[PDB]
Amino acid sequence: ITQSQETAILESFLELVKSPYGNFASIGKLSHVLNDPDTLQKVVAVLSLTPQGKQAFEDRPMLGKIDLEQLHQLPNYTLGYMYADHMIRNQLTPPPVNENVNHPFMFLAAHLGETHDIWHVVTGCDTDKPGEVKLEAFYTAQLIPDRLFLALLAKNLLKTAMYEVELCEQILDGLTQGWMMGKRAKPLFGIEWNKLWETPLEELQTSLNIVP
Amino acid sequence: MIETITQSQETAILESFLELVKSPYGNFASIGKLSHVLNDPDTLQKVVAVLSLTPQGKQAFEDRPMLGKIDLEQLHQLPNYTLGYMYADHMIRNQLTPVNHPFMFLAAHLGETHDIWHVVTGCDTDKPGEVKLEAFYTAQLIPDRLFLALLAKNLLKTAMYEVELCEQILDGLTQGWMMGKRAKPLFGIEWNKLWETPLEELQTSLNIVP
Numbered sequence: 193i194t195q196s197q198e199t200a201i202l203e204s205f206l207e208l209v210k211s212p213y214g215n216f217a218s219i220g221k222l223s224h225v226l227n228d229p230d231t232l233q234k235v236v237a238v239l240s241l242t243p244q245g246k247q248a249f250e251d252r253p254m255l256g257k258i259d260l261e262q263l264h265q266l267p268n269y270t271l272g273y274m275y276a277d278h279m280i281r282n283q284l285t286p287p288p289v290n291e292n293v294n295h296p297f298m299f300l301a302a303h304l305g306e307t308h309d310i311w312h313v314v315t316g317c318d319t320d321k322p323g324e325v326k327l328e329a330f331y332t333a334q335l336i337p338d339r340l341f342l343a344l345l346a347k348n349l350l351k352t353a354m355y356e357v358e359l360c361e362q363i364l365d366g367l368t369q370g371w372m373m374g375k376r377a378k379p380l381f382g383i384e385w386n387k388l389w390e391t392p393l394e395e396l397q398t399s400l401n402i403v404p
Numbered sequence: 405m406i407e408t409i410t411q412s413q414e415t416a417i418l419e420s421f422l423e424l425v426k427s428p429y430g431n432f433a434s435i436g437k438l439s440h441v442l443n444d445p446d447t448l449q450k451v452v453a454v455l456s457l458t459p460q461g462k463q464a465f466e467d468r469p470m471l472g473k474i475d476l477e478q479l480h481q482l483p484n485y486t487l488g489y490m491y492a493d494h495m496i497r498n499q500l501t502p503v504n505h506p507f508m509f510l511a512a513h514l515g516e517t518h519d520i521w522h523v524v525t526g527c528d529t530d531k532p533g534e535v536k537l538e539a540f541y542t543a544q545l546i547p548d549r550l551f552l553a554l555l556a557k558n559l560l561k562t563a564m565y566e567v568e569l570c571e572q573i574l575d576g577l578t579q580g581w582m583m584g585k586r587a588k589p590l591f592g593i594e595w596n597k598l599w600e601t602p603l604e605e606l607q608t609s610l611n612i613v614p
């Protein structure tokens with residue numbers, strides 16, 4: 193990499209070390225500079241080696257508009273109930289329906305962006321700090337050879353060492369668990385979640401080889 | 405964290421971390437500079453106190469046991485299965501070469517047994533082996549901050565410069581972390597009187613399962 197690209201990476205990395213979790217603007221900035229088109233094409237090609245991956249780039253399945261209230265009426269063992277409950281408790285607002293996902297790079301980012309909270313629920317990762325690290329290790333296992341989630345792991349390890357080292361064991365226990373769970377699970381990329389709202393979460397996890 | 409990391413400490417820690425990111429592995433100078441600003445005396449005091457909770461830890465700060473001079477050639481005359489031979493062999497193959505205050509003993513004991521921890525834990529010398537060993541250290545030296553920050557810098561270096569190692573690097577981290585929590589404390593061991601112990605028996609005694 194050029195010295196210029198390197199300084200933009202390190203500057204974004206420093207902003208993430210110094211700011212709270214969930215700094216999506218700086219994560220996006222780090223992403224732009226860290227995952228270049230060559231990296232993104234290799235991720236697209238790897239994900240495309242499975243039939244579910246290949247089809248998802250062809251069909252570009254999107255979530256669509258989500259009715260949190262209606263999902264919250266489902267039986268409380270379903271994916272739909274659990275997802276809605278996760279959104280209420282964490283004060284999260286569902287993703288805005290997006291339309292420009294033509295290029296594979298744009299579908300990759302839009303699909304992963306809008307299903308982030310669903311992957312939280314399906315992998316069983318809490319939204320506390322060790323749970324975010326756990327989910328990032330899970331992403332790292334599934335999106336090889338991506339660079340972003342590896343760097344997000346690094347940023348959270350440094351943040352732990354500098355500001356809150358009492359969390360060390362819980363943070364590395366989470367990273368360790370999400371890495372192993374990520375290697376063992378089936379690919380989550382490309383799944384059409386809005387057809388699974390009434391599926392019981394535990395059976396969905398079992399069929400995905402997720403053992404929470 | 406109840407103690408402060410001041411603005412000034414944060415600035416010095418980040419500058420030291422950036423130099424480690426831009427330098428190759430094995431920069432023991434720059435690692436010492438990160439250590440000095442990151443493991444400040446409050447942290448070193450807690451590490452000493454935590455390590456002194458065991459009898460071997462307490463004794464090690466009293467007696468301050470040091471390796472002393474070591475004759476690699478003589479150690480390399482021992483049976484193949486021994487710690488002494490295995491260590492000497494490790495030094496020869498990689499062409500490596502080998503205090504009254506608690507914080508000074510702490511740093512000098514860990515610095516001089518670093519190669520021995522490599523041998524005893526079974527960590528290779530390549531980059532994934534260093535990360536494995538670093539994870540082993542952060543399991544054993546809670547509430548230290550240096551080794552966690554060293555994991556962070558090697559994950560960032562992998563993301564930026566050598567992403568194809570990602571799998572090996574996180575497999576190494578994961579194995580070292582688990583092995584480190586499961587093993588008995590390695591700190592404070594007088595290795596100079598274990599050279600003739602078969603390495604595999606010493607590992608069993610220490611609950612090290614490679």
Ligand SMILES: CCCCCCCC/C=C/CCCCCCCC(=O)O
Binds near residue numbers: 213227232301335344
């Ligand atoms: C494989 C290439 C990936 C490029 C697209 C990445 C965009 C995916 C969007 C989901 C990112 C969610 C990560 C947010 C973590 C917040 C916790 C933290 O601050 O560490």
Ligand SMILES: CCCCCCCC/C=C/CCCCCCCC(=O)O
Binds near residue numbers: 510515545
């Ligand atoms: C608990 C307080 C620790 C204070 C002692 C600090 C020094 C410890 C001994 C040095 C360990 C060397 C580990 C460095 C591995 C080199 C690979 C790399 O560059 O990442």
Ligand SMILES: [Cl-]
Binds near residue numbers: 281317318319
């Ligand atoms: Cl939650």
Ligand SMILES: [Mg+2]
Binds near residue numbers: 282284308312319
């Ligand atoms: Mg979420």
Ligand SMILES: [Mg+2]
Binds near residue numbers: 308312319324
């Ligand atoms: Mg999250």
